[PDB]
Paper text:
Dipeptidyl peptidase 9 **(**DPP9) is a serine protease cleaving N-terminal dipeptides preferentially post-proline with (patho)physiological roles in the immune system and cancer. On the molecular level, proteases of the DPPIV family are serine aminopeptidases that remove dipeptides from the N-terminus of substrates having a Pro or an Ala residue in the second position (NH_2_-XaaPro/Ala). [name] and DPP9 are the only known intracellular members of this family, both localize to the cytosol, the nucleus and associate with the plasma membrane.
Since [name] and DPP9 share a very similar substrate binding mechanisms *in vitro*, and since DPP9 crystals are notorious for being less well ordered, we also tested for a possible interaction between [name] and [name]. The well-ordered R-segment, a hallmark of ligand binding, was well defined and ordered and supports full occupation of the active sites. There was no trace of electron density for the rest of the peptide ([Fig fig2] and [Table tbl1]). (B) Shown is the N-terminal di-peptide of [name] bound to both DPP9 and to [name].
Residue numbers in the entry:
A (entry chain A), B (entry chain B): 48 to 72, 78 to 105, 109 to 138, 148 to 897
The structure:
């Protein structure tokens, strides 16, 4: 063969090319179905959703009772409405929200009350309650406040839509939107105090639980209100209280660089103490008229450590829908033992200073009342937290039924219907001892598996189940038809068997089912077609309600249609020497000259909880992998072992071994291609990735000087001893029980292994990164300098983990092309060597 | 004219080249003469001095009463002795100490008591006092303490050498070194309280005073002790007391990168508040036994803003020889108004909590007693502070004679013998008003200029004046013979005639004159010969005491001989279009070729207070400029207008106009060289400097995008609003009244002016730099990314403003050479364009 050299564009010509290709180019979400219940009118439902017009607001569309099955009905988007703090900027990093405006909302089917934060303000309108359905945009009603700082995480009370709660300065507040009454429920954080002195918070999820467990709230309204004798009621808020006094303090640069100051930050470094956590409960007494009689604040009868021995993370929490028990999913620190636990409000006593008054209240509580561990699972690998957990109405007082999902039985996540016996505990507090390990555990009456197979149910990033308690069905999202396509399925939970698919093959679907289970919405795409949102109607043959079929109904969002100037990559697979099928994407270069070999650029992530290779449209996010092909680079992407959507066995492959397996799969796939395509120049191969991808880019250059000419590492994790507990320990365990794994997985501990030629290493970092701190890069550079190695370095001083400012994104793309051109593809590059 | 191209060495090759040449390659200082008074012994004096054996410690040599004039005598060095915290590490950055061991020392003439810090320890020995002279090394006596943290800045009481003082946690302590008694004199700083809430100090110079006024001390012993009736005595200490509570707080990265924390410290940013400062005095009453009886603390009778209207910085301070008055040099904030001031101890009243006893104490002090301004000068350029100031024993008790130095009168710094009348002031505290700005001023009886001419007396960086009161002479260093050589001069202060030069021309000398004025020591070098140190004997014909002659006496340190593998540069000069002569240094590329033109690297500083071109040995400091010449680069260095040693008009050139002029001079001299020598390729010129030098490198690349191919900016000031008060306001003035100056002199405010070609800009910065904070670089990167301009960046995370870690230095030289080779010198560099 004969080497292809990429054209040598100037920095200003490359800026032009990139700007011209970009000169062209968020879909609906948070859907809600509301019945009109109007016989005379032509509309059966009204659907509300968030979407970009620009800013992000509530829209609505009208679901008609029938359709012209000749034509395609495209629903019109009626606008519903007529319109950053260091708390807003940090939360919108933890959720990975790129949008601006309304991020989420809250609704009360009874009242028709919408409640939503929008900038610094909290608003509320009504629609679809007794007050009817607007035919034009509504003007929102601002909630009044005496509070001086931004109100975070507003929630409607499900039992009373006059009452909302919110967090201000790390304490829970309630406000009545009709009576204008306002009230602070917790006095845990002085806002005037400094960081080190206070370090306490109520109703807020701590950093680790937003970053690594995607849980953002830490208080939960009780769904039912209890009546006082004189025609009032009691409302309940369960909340987690946090004390981060032992948690290590990090400083990270304040975005306003002019100040030259840093922001204090609680970061549980791997090995260090996580925050101290316990449950609490506010009892709020309301009189008949809707004003606050009194607010009792209640603590657990015994300490948290005693009742929930071994629990470190409060992964999830809420209420049974009866309002009877507060439930919670709890992990041990190793993230190998998960427990579902019911907690009676009778476990909470009022907080008292008097030692003799508490011992009085303690005596009042009976020994029968005790935490109930309705479920427990263990794994030699790790427990992946998900959002799937459905509690049924209680038939007998002494059983609870529920659906949960687990990778622990099969090696693959499946739904399971479980009945638990609510036995009274062996243990009595009377004895005055610390309860045994299995003293609170409930017997398992039945454990019916609703699904099974060499495929998994999805329960993260908004994937979930939807139970039809009438037809005794459960809709879920799965990889049953393929690992590269997510599809909607339905199945009986009473007598499970056949698993009916509802989405059409050849597309990967993100799905949302009406609360009435008579409609669903699919956001679907494939490698060649950009995302469409469509609305399908569910009906059953009248001989068997257990059986469900779909009928396309109306389009909510039409695709722009196979984008021109974009050549999609072709998916491939190959059998590993490890006995797994690995999948990849190949961007062949545009205008393929026969008799020529091209420089190959391997883009990588390779970390857990992620899959790059699937049948989705990569034209939006990975448009620049296409642009590289248009300049005459081969671009390769390989989902190596540890990637998600392949079962726990596949994922657990790098437990304790991070950075020691992923590249051997990247190279195995990179060679399977070279053997099959003589147009791949293995002498000019570069690797680029961000975050975990940037990590492996550096491992690629240490482990394999031979294969990879240049590594471009963005926000790389150079030192696992610095990452947080929630993530690092899930995969690497405590650094005492993996001395060697932490050493071999930390690229900064191994700077001598880097090349002694320049123009091979390029390091990129967000200067204000609060997730992968900039000290990963600053400490690797320190050891490269000692080892007399050379590096190239671009800092993005306004950026954090993600790149938000576009000027930054443009510079990153411009530099990356120029760098690959100057140090890989072009003629001048081969001369430099 | 054929282009020469430098041999493209690899990164590993270039590292070897440097390590090989680096494989090849401190003189004595702090000299002090003690007379032996041995009429029968062969030795007249014994000199004590600090030098490197290895550690830096005290040595002595013997001065012969007589010498064989036929031969040279080389004095053998006898060792006198028998063998970092955060605040000791910052002091060494402010002083710019590289050496380890003993930095300075004290000596009580009467007792023979030495006193010196060495690491954490404080030690004393005796030699040359009543107790005679050691023939063998003495053992250092540790001053014991109860003080937890390290002790900074020890000083011997001259009025009793049993007592010493020192600073501990920003308070003044005294310790008797025979009774081991240890007393704390000030209670202004809580070591355990956080620095944000404390920010008060006593006896310490604040940051700007150490950085910009090279004053490293804030307390002063009274040099005589008043006697008591019982037979004890009163010792006194004058001390500056600062409050940094209103001074902006900055965060620099902690050097322990593992912690990912930042150290808070107080930085007076241009235009913000300098610390509130005042004078105080500690009266220590000691008994006849030597035990402390009592300690009264005393404040000024009126606030510092009243007694010293206008004074922003206390520049220097101390006591007159009898200790009748304490004196102080005082600047206004614009540093255009120097005042000298006498403050009687009688101005200080005991500090009393009672509001009514303090009133009885105020009236007790006479209204006659008042601050005495004995000298005031003003300039529309600015005041350069200096260590020259001499007060004569008082003859008339209403007059005071002294010697000061000033550029204000003639435009060059010259000595002046001044008598001032101490007329009791008109202002009275009884009247109870504030004084007019002229009320403490003093009539000026005479003012005889001792020197004059277009050349300056030197009074910075250890240059000072020795004063023979017996013969009424004053020895001083000056630029009279040339700007490129410093020389030792002597002249009468009674009948100031002509100026006898004592040093030999053809060399540049730093000098040090026996307190007896019968000897002097010169450390001297020239462009070709490394620094020597010789001892000369002063002699006068018995007919005329003014006539002064020298005679070589002994070698203290022999030259290392002319170094091989080092060609020196040749000094040049050129008439500027501005009218001034400018000097330069040319390193011709070793092994010149006929007809061939070579790549050129201009090393630059160009800031004030510094001259790079002079007749001193550059073989140590600028060794690598010659290493650049040995590879093929022409190397050029020019002292543009602003640089020191050429008078106040030459310096004042860039008042308010920093950045706007300097490069015109650098390019003028570059073109002068290009006309006379045709080997200077002007199509291949790089510029490189550190700090101000890196600043001008960035200005050269904006302003002259045509003359300069690459710029390599080290630790460069990019935003004058960020730099400190005492420096920026001295030249650029307050920012709100020179708004255009600050804009035009700030490269980051002009990022659009930078090239759009890559491989032309290199930013180098110490990550922990606390002087030119790394925000200068990060904010400039901020604006360069916005503007879409390319840059190369290198960080040194171990280093602050200097480069101390040897591995950081090796990597800097190696990158600097490779970047020059790959982007300026070689043929591949010509292909890149």
């Amino acid at each position: 063969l004969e080497p292809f050299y990429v054209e040598r564009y100037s920095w200003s010509q490359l800026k032009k090319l990139l700007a011209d290709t970009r000169k062209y180019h968020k879909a609906p979400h948070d859907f809600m179905f509301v019945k009109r219940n109007d016989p005379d009118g032509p509309h059966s439902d009204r659907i509300y959703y968030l979407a970009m017009s620009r800013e992000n607001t509530l829209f609505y569309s009208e679901i008609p009772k029938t359709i012209n099955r000749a034509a395609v009905l495209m629903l019109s988007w009626k606008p519903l409405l007529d319109l950053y703090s260091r708390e807003e900027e940090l939360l919108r990093e933890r959720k990975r929200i790129g949008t601006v405006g309304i991020a989420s909302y809250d609704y009360h089917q009874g009242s028709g009350t919408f409640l939503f934060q929008a900038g610094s303000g909290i608003y509320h309108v009504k629609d679809g309650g007794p007050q009817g359905f607007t035919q034009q945009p509504l003007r929102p009603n601002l909630v009044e406040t005496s509070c001086p700082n931004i109100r975070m995480d507003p929630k409607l009370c499900p039992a009373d839509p006059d009452w909302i709660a919110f967090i201000h300065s790390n304490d829970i507040w309630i406000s009545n939107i009709v009576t204008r009454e306002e009230r602070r429920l917790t006095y845990v954080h002085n806002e005037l105090a400094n960081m080190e002195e206070d370090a306490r918070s109520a109703g807020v999820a701590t950093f680790v639980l937003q970053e690594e467990f995607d849980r953002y709230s830490g208080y939960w309204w009780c769904p039912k209100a209890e009546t006082t004798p004189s025609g009032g009621k009691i409302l309940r808020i369960l909340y987690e209280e946090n004390d981060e006094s032992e948690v290590e303090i990090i400083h990270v640069t304040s975005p306003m660089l002019e100040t030259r100051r840093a922001d204090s930050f609680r970061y549980p470094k791997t090995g260090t103490a996580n925050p101290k956590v316990t449950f609490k409960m506010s009892e709020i007494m309301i009189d008949a008229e809707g004003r606050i009689i009194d607010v009792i604040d209640k603590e657990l009868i015994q300490p948290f450590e005693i009742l929930f021995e071994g629990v470190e993370y409060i992964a999830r929490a809420g209420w049974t829908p009866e309002g009877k028990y507060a439930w919670s999913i709890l992990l041990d620190r190793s993230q190998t033992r998960l427990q579902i636990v019911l907690i009676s409000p009778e476990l909470f006593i009022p907080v008292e200073d008097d030692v003799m008054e508490r011992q009085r209240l303690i005596e009042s509580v009976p020994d029968s009342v005790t935490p109930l561990i309705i479920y427990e699972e263990t794994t030699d690998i790790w427990i992946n937290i998900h959002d799937i957990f459905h509690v049924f109405p209680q038939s007998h007082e002494e059983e609870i039924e529920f659906i949960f999902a687990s990778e622990c039985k099969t090696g693959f996540r499946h739904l399971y219907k479980i009945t638990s016996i609510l036995k009274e505990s062996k243990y009595k507090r009377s004895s005055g001892g610390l309860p045994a390990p299995s003293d609170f555990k409930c017997p398992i009456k039945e454990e019916i598996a609703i699904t099974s197979g060499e495929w998994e149910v999805l329960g993260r990033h908004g994937s979930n189940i939807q139970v039809d308690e009438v037809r005794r069905l459960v809709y879920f999202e799965g990889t049953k038809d393929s690992p590269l396509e997510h599809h909607l399925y339905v199945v009986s939970y009473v007598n499970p068997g056949e698993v009916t698919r509802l989405t059409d093959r050849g597309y990967s679907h993100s799905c949302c089912i009406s609360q009435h289970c008579d409609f669903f919405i699919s956001k679907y795409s494939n490698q060649k077609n950009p995302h469409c949102v469509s609305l399908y109607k569910l009906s059953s043959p009248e001989d068997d309600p257990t059986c469900k079929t779909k009928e396309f109904w109306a389009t909510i969002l039409d695709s722009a249609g196979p984008l021109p100037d974009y050549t999609p990559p072709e998916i491939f697979s190959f059998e590993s020497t490890t006995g797994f099928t690995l999948y990849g994407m190949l961007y062949k270069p545009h205008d393929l000259q026969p008799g020529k070999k091209y420089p190959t650029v391997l883009f990588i992530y390779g970390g857990p909880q992620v899959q790059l290779v699937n049948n989705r449209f990569k034209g939006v996010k990975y448009f620049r992998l296409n642009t590289l092909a248009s300049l005459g680079y081969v671009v390769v992407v390989i989902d190596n072992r540890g990637s998600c959507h392949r079962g726990l066995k596949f994922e657990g492959a790098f437990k304790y071994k991070m950075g020691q397996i992923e590249i051997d799969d990247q190279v195995e796939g990179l060679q399977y291609l070279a053997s099959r395509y003589d147009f791949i120049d293995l002498d000019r191969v570069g690797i680029h990735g961000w975050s975990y991808g940037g990590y492996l880019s550096l491992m690629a250059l240490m482990q394999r000087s031979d294969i990879f000419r240049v590594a471009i590492a963005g926000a790389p994790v150079t030192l696992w001893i610095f990452y947080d507990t929630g993530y690092t320990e899930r995969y690497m365990g405590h650094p005492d029980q993996n001395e060697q794994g932490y050493y071999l997985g930390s690229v900064a501990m191994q700077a001598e292994k880097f090349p002694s030629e320049p123009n091979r290493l390029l390091l990129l970092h967000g200067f204000l990164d609060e997730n992968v701190h900039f000290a990963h890069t600053s400490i690797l550079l320190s050891f490269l300098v000692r080892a007399g190695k050379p590096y190239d370095l671009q800092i993005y001083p306004q950026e954090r983990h993600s790149i938000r400012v576009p000027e930054s994104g443009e510079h990153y793309e411009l530099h990356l092309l120029h760098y690959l051109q100057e140090n890989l593809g072009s003629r001048i590059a081969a001369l430099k060597v």
